[PDB]
Amino acid sequence: MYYLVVNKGQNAFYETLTKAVDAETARNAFIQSLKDDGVQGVWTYDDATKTFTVQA
């Protein structure tokens, strides 16, 4: 569905919000594009917030 992501590492901050239809879809589909920008990091998304944080 509509989830937002925020990448946090040591010297790079990138966050994007895109329509993913579902959860794991946002987990698999979004993670690719979200990583497509800042793959270097790995995200940890919450359900309470509905946001993933790609941290490297």
- Tell me the chain's radius of gyration from C-alpha atoms: 10
CA atoms of 1 and 8, how far apart (whole Å): 22
List the structure tokens of 47: 């359900």
Distances (CA, A) of 28 to 10, 24, 41, 55: 24, 6, 15, 16
Domains of the chain (ranges; CATH) run 1-56 (3.10.20.10)
